[PDB]
Amino acid sequence: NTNFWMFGLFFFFYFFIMGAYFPFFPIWLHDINHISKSDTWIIFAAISLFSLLFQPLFGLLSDKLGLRKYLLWIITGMLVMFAPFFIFIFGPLLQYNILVGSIVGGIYLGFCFNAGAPAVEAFIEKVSRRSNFEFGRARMFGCVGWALCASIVGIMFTINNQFVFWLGSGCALILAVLLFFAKTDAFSLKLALELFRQPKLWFLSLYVIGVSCTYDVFDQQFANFFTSFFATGEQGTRVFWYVTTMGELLNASIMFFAPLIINRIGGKNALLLAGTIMSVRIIGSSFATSALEVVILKTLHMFEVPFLLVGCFKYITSQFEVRFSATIYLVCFCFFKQLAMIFMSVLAGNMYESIGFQGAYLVLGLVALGFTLISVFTLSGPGPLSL
Ligand SMILES: CCCCCCCCCO[C@@H]1O[C@H](CO)[C@@H](O)[C@H](O)[C@H]1O
Ligand SMILES: O=[N+]([O-])c1ccc(O[C@H]2O[C@H](CO)[C@H](O)[C@H](O)[C@H]2O)cc1
Numbered sequence: 245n246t247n248f249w250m251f252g253l254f255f256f257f258y259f260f261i262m263g264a265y266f267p268f269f270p271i272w273l274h275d276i277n278h279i280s281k282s283d284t285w286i287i288f289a290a291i292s293l294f295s296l297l298f299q300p301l302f303g304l305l306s307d308k309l310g311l312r313k314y315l316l317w318i319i320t321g322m323l324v325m326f327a328p329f330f331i332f333i334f335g336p337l338l339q340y341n342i343l344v345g346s347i348v349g350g351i352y353l354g355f356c357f358n359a360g361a362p363a364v365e366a367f368i369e370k371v372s373r374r375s376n377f378e379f380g381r382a383r384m385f386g387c388v389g390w391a392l393c394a395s396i397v398g399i400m401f402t403i404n405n406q407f408v409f410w411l412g413s414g415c416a417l418i419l420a421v422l423l424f425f426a427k428t429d430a431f432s433l434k435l436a437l438e439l440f441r442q443p444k445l446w447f448l449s450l451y452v453i454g455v456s457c458t459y460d461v462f463d464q465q466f467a468n469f470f471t472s473f474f475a476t477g478e479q480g481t482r483v484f485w486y487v488t489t490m491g492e493l494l495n496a497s498i499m500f501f502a503p504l505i506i507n508r509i510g511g512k513n514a515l516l517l518a519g520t521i522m523s524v525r526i527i528g529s530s531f532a533t534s535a536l537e538v539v540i541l542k543t544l545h546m547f548e549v550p551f552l553l554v555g556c557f558k559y560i561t562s563q564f565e566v567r568f569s570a571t572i573y574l575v576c577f578c579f580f581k582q583l584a585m586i587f588m589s590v591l592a593g594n595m596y597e598s599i600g601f602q603g604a605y606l607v608l609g610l611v612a613l614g615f616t617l618i619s620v621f622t623l624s625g626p627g628p629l630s631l
Pocket of ligand 2: 386
């Protein structure tokens with residue numbers, strides 16, 4: 245099949261390039277650029293600031309272009325600059341000169357990745373229902389491409405720590421290739437503003453601010469929580485990329501069967517089920533005592549992704565007009581998720597101190613479970629009462 249294999253490999257090489265930068269990002273600043281953690285909380289604040297003017301902006305374009313590939317050409321164009329970004333630009337600029345004047349080099353990561361990954365999901369999602377395949381399939385490539393690169397980072401961490409970027413950049417032109425050969429064949433912005441007074445959006449986004457925002461702030465400093473339950477902070481880290489690498493292969497597997505499960509259960513129960521798996525991880529982490537316990541908890545993250553990603557599209561397409569699938573994705577499951585993740589993280593630090601780590605996860609989990617249970621009623625569609 246023409247589109248499936250091209251855009252399936254597109255995810256493979258796209259997330260390979262996100263898998264070098266992202267899943268080990270704080271370490272890069274910590275060790276390899278010697279940046280204090282009283283300064284990395286300001287870098288993320290600017291990588292998430294250019295993400296807020298791009299994410300909605302990418303949503304309207306990703307619809308107005310429809311199946312036109314221009315917006316995805318820009319991304320594949322900017323991703324070629326990946327190697328000389330980290331190695332020669334971003335790297336020396338943040339340290340030697342002021343962090344503020346280099347925190348605007350997090351514009352790059354705002355465009356390509358934080359606001360560009362979901363634009364790739366959304367676009368390939370539209371193509372996913374003009375060809376004959378399921379979005380969960382092909383998207384499953386992202387996890388294994390993420391896993392492949394994930395291993396190589398650790399495998400290459402002491403050998404040549406610039407290599408992952410150089411290889412990453414080489415895949416960007418491979419990404420240009422697959423974008424070209426693949427062959428694939430409305431609204432106005434004032435109709436777009438109609439959705440914001442439709443009360444069916446308010447309850448979808450409520451679910452995101454409630455369940456998904458709480459979950460992604462929970463997975464913020466999970467690295468600090470995870471390490472304590474290994475004998476050495478360092479040795480626990482050395483087992484961390486093992487879990488991440490391995491569990492992502494499982495994650496693709498879970499996603500493999502995801503769309504079949506998703507297609508009948510329906511969209512709403514897909515999110516409710518995702519919300520339950522999310523809440524279970526957030527609450528049950530309060531009852532963590534041993535390494536095996538915390539390891540298995542982290543693997544719930546691999547049960548969670550398929551249902552959230554695949555499910556949200558099934559929801560957005562099923563209950564909303566498709567003339568807005570990219571927009572209400574990049575505004576609800578990305579923008580509104582990111583906008584609320586500014587504040588829910590702020591008082592997650594005033595809960596690390598105010599009531600400890602496991603006591604912080606308890607407040608979050610009962611807000612996560614809180615809004616999961618609430619969205620059986622606020623979300624329109626068929627609830628779990630049907631089966
Ligand atoms: C504006 C200031 C920019 C400073 C940039 C410093 C670049 C240093 C590059 O080092 C080289 O890296 C290669 C891999 O990238 C290795 O193969 C090689 O052994 C090593 O010598
Ligand atoms: O910028 N974002 O919006 C964004 C970046 C990375 C990301 O990673 C997810 O997909 C990855 C590959 O599939 C892994 O599975 C990972 O475990 C998931 O969390 C998700 C969202």
